[PDB]
Symmetry: D2
Subunit: 505 residues, 4 copies
């Protein structure tokens, strides 16, 4: 126990890790049924702080066998959980919501430690992610069935909606809490059980969330958390006949593979895949609203969101004023450790993410783009990249065609409204899109014309639990958030009663 003893590795932010551990929120095991568990062979994978390079802890490196045990625990728990009243599940889910909010400051710090975003953004993610738990606790009691007028006098027709069964959920690293709750909350609300595989890059927040679910009275087996061999876990989820639904948020390539694999057992599948959000700034945009909106929509989480602005189309008349004011706004951003106050840009998740950003910037500059701000690795090193604006961008550039997932904003000049809309709609992406215009007719027209699941009109921050989020075309299937998000975890049942009598008098 002497301070020189090396059992707990000494390092930066040890005070924060001790406080998280004293709160019961610092886990180094997965959760299967009523036990916190190691992998069967004791293998582990490290979780590192992307801002310092230091070890936080190791988590199990699980695979097929552990995922099968998690699925069996969820299947066993489903019978009782699904037969509880909606009111009973709602009270328990509200207890989980209250615990997430009560522990938001510590949970926010855990997101900073493993993912790197600024603390204000991490605490905001706890409020946002917990909002799905509250929303679906309320919505659990509003799974309404129907009575349909029957065209046959002797028959009566009903529609019931019942939980689908065991859900397999796979989440990415960019929102380590909100991506878990967006999937787990509606599934539990409907009466499903879940086996969730968080990103191996950011698993600690999912484990803290599951510890708080247990404290809330969520029975063992209703929530299970496994990680490690993502391929092996995914195959166990796809091969299981008890897994009736899969939900995935992540890369397009992995999502397409999961969709293809789900076909052999006819699972219900909902996915949110890569986006490439266009943003159209028209001549009649309110300049301050457009600058503030694009700053927020582009550089939130250092550009590492599914809905982030990927390319900005600026109309010829406002181009110079927008480029100047947008550059001034971006120059105010500051990169660093998310646990330092005043920091507004965190590091990119890993070296692969940084290499992609550099590839996009190099390609654009080679094809004629002008670096108006940034355009290089930050002086801090590691995976910090300077917030960048690339003027005179074009449809031949890699950043125009593909998702950069980094703090780079390319500007494309355009002449007519019809030109910008047709260009925005000319891709296989269909997640978020944005438009800035003060005119009622133009605003409504652009919002209707855009072939995207979500449109911000004079708004750069559109994320909410109350509205349906998801993609069109190759950006996804199904929706998350809103009353419709719950339908993904239910099966409709038509009941036809026959030999019915006519009413009397």
């Amino acid at each position: 126990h002497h301070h020189s003893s090396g059992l707990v590795p000494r390092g930066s932010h040890m005070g924060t890790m001790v406080q998280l551990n004293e709160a019961g929120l610092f886990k180094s095991q997965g959760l299967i049924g009523d036990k916190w568990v190691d992998a069967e062979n004791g293998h582990t994978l490290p979780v590192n702080n992307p801002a310092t390079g230091e070890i936080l802890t190791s988590v199990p490196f699980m695979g097929k066998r552990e995922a099968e045990k998690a699925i069996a625990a969820a299947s066993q728990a489903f019978t009782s959980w699904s037969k509880r009243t909606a009111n009973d599940r709602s009270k328990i889910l509200r207890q989980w919501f209250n615990l997430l909010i009560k522990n938001k400051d510590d949970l926010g710090k855990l997101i900073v430690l493993e993912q790197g975003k600024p603390l204000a953004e991490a605490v905001g993610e706890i409020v946002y992610g917990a909002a799905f738990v509250e929303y679906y606790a309320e919505e659990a009691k509003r799974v309404y069935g129907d009575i349909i007028p029957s065209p046959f006098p002797e028959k009566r027709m009903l529609v019931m909606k019942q939980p689908v069964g065991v859900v397999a959920a796979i989440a990415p690293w960019n929102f380590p809490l909100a991506m878990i709750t967006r999937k787990v909350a509606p599934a539990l609300a409907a009466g499903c059980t879940v086996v969730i595989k968080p990103s191996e890059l950011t698993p600690l927040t999912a484990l803290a969330a599951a510890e708080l679910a247990l404290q809330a009275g969520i029975p063992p087996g209703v929530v299970n958390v496994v990680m490690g061999d993502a391929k092996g876990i995914g195959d166990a989820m796809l091969d299981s006949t008890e897994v009736r639904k899969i939900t995935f948020t992540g890369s397009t390539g992995v999502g397409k593979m999961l969709l293809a694999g789900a076909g052999k057992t006819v699972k219900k599948v909902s996915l949110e895949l890569g986006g490439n959000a266009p943003c159209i700034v028209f001549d009649d945009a309110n300049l301050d609203v457009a600058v503030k909106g694009v700053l927020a929509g582009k550089y939130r989480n250092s550009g590492q969101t599914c809905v982030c602005i990927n390319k900005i189309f600026v109309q010829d008349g406002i181009y110079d004023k927008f480029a100047e004011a947008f550059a001034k706004a971006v120059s105010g951003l500051r990169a660093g450790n998310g646990l330092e106050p005043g920091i507004t840009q965190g590091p990119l998740i890993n070296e692969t993410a940084l290499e992609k950003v550099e590839r996009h910037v190099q390609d654009a500059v080679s094809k004629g783009a002008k670096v108006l701000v940034g355009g290089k690795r930050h002086s801090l090193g590691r995976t910090f990249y300077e917030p960048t604006i690339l003027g005179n961008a074009s449809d031949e550039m890699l950043i125009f065609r593909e998702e950069v997932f980094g703090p780079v904003a390319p500007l494309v000049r355009f002449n007519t409204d019809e030109e910008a809309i047709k260009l925005a709609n000319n891709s296989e992406f269909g997640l978020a899109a944005y438009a800035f215009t003060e005119n009622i007719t133009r605003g409504w027209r652009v919002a209707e014309s855009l072939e995207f699941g979500m449109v911000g009109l004079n708004e750069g921050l559109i994320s909410t639990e109350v509205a349906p989020f998801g993609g069109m075309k190759q950006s996804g299937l199904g929706r998350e958030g809103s009353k419709y998000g719950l339908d993904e975890y239910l099966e409709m049942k038509y009941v036809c009663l026959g030999n019915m009598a006519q009413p009397v008098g």
Copy 2:
């Protein structure tokens, strides 16, 4: 032109084919855009009458190239069709509904000629199939968006619902009209265009329906009909990025293959696959209701429906009375040509279907089943099979585990309600299920407990356009019929308006 001339092959039912041809409903070409077309190489496939073995006509044997041209015509027509008002599409769809009903007697006779069901059942299928056209003509004007209370004072939140795009539809042979309209009507109502591939066994009814769609004012390219190389057409539909949604009704193996193939372009997929419907006759069932209901639910279309009763669980106390009265009811059925009045059983579609029925009957008899009625090929030969009841059936028999798709009813004795429900729910099928009980509590309990998309409670005939039809588990994805059927052909869009002001005073 002398009566000895053989240009038109002479045969039975030539008067009916001449009347269909004079009505413009006897087609021997596919439909791509504004042209009725042959296959590019002039290859064809014959359409034969299953009751007589005679040729009706030949249709084109199309493949990849023709399906691509059909997809391009649908894509070109989509821009204008999707931008019409819902009221405009509704008037045109109602004109199509009225033409289907006006021509129902001739259209019913065409279904008899190619598929073989009795004429009363074929005319009933026209009324039922046309009912989807009427339903979605009305529902087109009820695609409601939402205004959601925003938790941000400065934002307003809307949900719009817009057509998905080009739809590829694949239909089976058992309901040659109703399977086309169940898919085409909601797609057109939403504002989609369609490329439909009917079964090569029963394509003439789909072509007659498309001729009437053109007469109704449905523009060229909005409905396209192709047939021939089902594998090649299916691959063209799956490989096309303009096809945004696929809808399939048919075998589980083909449906699983299509689901897997759709993954690579993230298409929206809805399917109705094989069913294996259990029917539970409890001790307190009204005997007459159960006998009449099982007769209708089992032998409609000679057992060749997705929702047909496949296995009957009869409680110990009512077993002898049910078996006796059910045998008497089945002995009244009569097999023959569907154009002869008094005929209530048509032939099985082909020799493969007859071999499967014989395989199921042989397997059951080998494992101890008792032939109470039928159990052999009908004296008419061809693919006519005698309506059959097999007593003392068990869970080890092929007919219990798999879909017979023929006029064979196996009876399984059971002791307790819990035993029957657990047995009914112990399969990967989840389409239709049936139960007969006079008790309120038992009836509601069995209806809630059954893991099937559709439950008939004291009802053997549950089919309707007003209720959602589809499967749970490996029997399907999505629903057809009802307001929910239209959601399969729409994409939700969340629009967030920002920089909004507070109301005044």
Copy 3:
């Protein structure tokens, strides 16, 4: 001198209507077209010519009671039909109204006076309610609610209320009948409808076509004459479970008060006093075209007409000039004459109210920019008028003119105009013209009115809920919600229920 000496000046049109079976001189009670019990009648006159078209019965309490008994008897069978069965019959009625729209439009012109284009438009609009509720009849959905008690299941059914008594005004002689009768019949109710004694012929033609469509006798009954006596029979009857009324605020308030003693469901649309706000950033052409249509439709005789226009200081002069040019293009005359865009006011009382509003405004400082006097045609034709320099002290600002007079009130700030628009006991329609998305949405949310046209002067549709807030009404007509006025909800709780198995 030999030859045909007609009594009226549109005999050819009346003969064509009569050959089509659409010119009636009797009411409808059950399976009979009937006269009043004493044979008394009232004349129906053409407001453009002063000529009698025909006489209709002058019925009262006794006939209304017989109509109520016929509706009550027919209700048992009509309400127990499937929604699909009622829907087919209502669609047959819709198709007949559309098939006969040209003749029916001419009948509206003859008895009410509006231009033929507007009258044919009213047939299309009024028939649209019949189509809408034929479709909606099959979408009366009940609910299954998750029960917090494991042993109970909870359902909501929606069933027809019963016999409906409907009272309609003269300004839309068809659309006011169908917007009440169509949802009532769709739900499974029966109706006893009293059209205005000024325009009863279109209601009777509509009922003849309902009978042709297969609507059974007694499901639709039409009575007219002693409006007070008929109204009292409707309020005193316990079989009348719901009252629907469109018309004056004073009569509506009296009916609401009277309905209380039998706890009837009541829905009404009363007087409106629609403000229209033209902001500085309005598209001038859209505002001029919209205000012209919203104000002068039916010569200003609609409860959604623009009654007062608030014009922002920066656009005032350009708007006043372009709006005067547009109003000067309107043409008054007989509605059967091509090119006519303004018909006569319904009667001398309506004209006297318009003259009272114009002389009050001029006495308090208003400037007559256009019109301001009786038209050269005489009778009840009034020149389309614009009154500049209007104020909140004027009778036209405080009360519903129901005539072709447009007062313009200058304003400075958005907040000033909105607070002024919201400072009355009216709450039916309101209008606003602005190109800005934030201002447009803000004004639409802020307005304390049931209906708001934003860059639109013509908002009427069967697909959206129409009705008033404050003293302008109760309930809504049009849209899915319009059907709920004719339905009673029923919560059914099933007990002693078992838990699902496995």
Copy 4:
């Protein structure tokens, strides 16, 4: 003799309520707890002991006007908060009601008299409306309707009606307050509520907890005293846009009539006369348990209580015997005593009505099977009674007894019982007991009542719409539909709209 001489016999309970801040002797107007303007008061007595608990103000017109002005002033800010903001505050109120449920239940026992188990149950039930509408506040969804005009877009918004005046009865001193206040506040309305002068203390405790929850001053106001004078101030105020009432049919009809002159939205729940049909194939134990609970809850003082029981000929003798055995197990007394299942009737007028119904039935041939007289405890305790050989000529069959008397009417056919059940002007609750699926669904559909218990005697819930048909009411309370009573629909039509691109 030294020692504490209390005025009442439950001083320990009153001291505990007072230490919890839940024992009030003033009304609430804005940010002040107030007396009447002249200092006049009225006593609130314990119905089991006759003892005064405390006095409350005897307010009238002036105080009600001040309460309305406070609600009107608070409405501007409360209605403009986000639904999420109102929801958090309403959930804080729900949590405080539940946290204080044991003390609040005891307060209901003291002023109304029901057993403590029922009073604590009423707190859970009444607080459930607060939770329900806190959740529903965020689900006030508007619509986007497909427009038949290419150049127009159509929206439906739903916005709070304004100041609500709520009048509640004495039989559920908390649940009748919250079922009106919770949806009103959730929608964004403000309220002026007048509890019954017989049971005002629970409403005042509920308002104290609303203030503790962060509900701003003026959003909830509580006044009592001159019920006629307060009611007239509520009806005469133009700022009161909606009235909600639960109570007697005569008072409700008067309020409905009075509301007409300002066209207020009105919802009410009036007297019921619930039939209960026990068919031959009923499960006997379910029927006996259900009828016992449905009839004797609150000693029969609920508007959903079973008022008359129709028993089919084949089950009559078995039902009468088992139902008599179950009724004999009921125990009358002070609600704070364990084992007590029947409390006293509210006052001597309530008792006199029960005695009038029992002597009328006995004079017309009814047989007293159990009870039929004042309880040995005296005061307003009446023995639980069963009257066999009842008929349609008896006062208890025609009118609401609101007491622990169960008349049994023998019947032969299902059609006879249903037609008899439907032959009144009441339409609140009805009950039926049958094991058969076809008969059960048929009776549930046929009954002309707003609520039907099928094999269930206890149907009350916040999740389902509750209210009457015919003369038993207007509007519904509970469920998503209960919130629509506090909202005004607005159709917004956007014009000059463009076609989408590509």
